[PDB]
Amino acid sequence: VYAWNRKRISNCVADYSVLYNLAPFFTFKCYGVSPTKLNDLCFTNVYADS
Amino acid sequence: FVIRGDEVRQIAPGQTGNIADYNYKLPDDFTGCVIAWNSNKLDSKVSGN
């Protein structure tokens, strides 16, 4: 938390339904969008963090 | 059904995962409950696949 990892990614066709087989207890609390609906919307820019 | 893991907890209207998709699914009303318990020492099978 002292030094974030913010990677402003570029254009791609990354399918958000890839981490569905991640480690157990993978919570998805989308406050504004829907988890299963992240397969048809075209977002402008994604700001990842870590 | 004998589904196991955190996919038991993910059983809900929507929230498509990796197991709950092609194992069991209800219409978008869910007019009922869902009972589940830890059957660790009950159905412990090594080669019961």
A48 interfaces chain B, CB cutoff of 8 Å: no
Separation of alpha carbons B10 and A26, rounded Å: 10
List of chain A residues whose C-beta atoms are within 8 Å of the C-beta of residue B14: 34-36
Q: Which amino acid belongs to residue B42? A: L
Quote the longest CA-to-CA distance of chain A: 35
Residue B47 CA: distances (Å) to CA of B37, B43, B44:
22, 11, 10
Whether A3 and A48 have beta carbons less than 8 Å apart is answered as no
> SS3 of B9, please?
helix
Reported structure resolution in angstroms: 3.4
Q: How were these coordinates obtained?
A: cryo-EM
A19 interfaces chain B, CB cutoff of 8 Å: no
Q: What is the DSSP letter of A19?
A: G
Task: Find the closest chain B residue to A22 by CA distance.
Answer: B18
Separation of alpha carbons A24 and B6, rounded Å: 6
Separation of alpha carbons B26 and A1, rounded Å: 41
Minimal Cβ distance to B15: which of A21, A24, A36: A36
Whether B4 and B44 have beta carbons less than 8 Å apart is answered as no
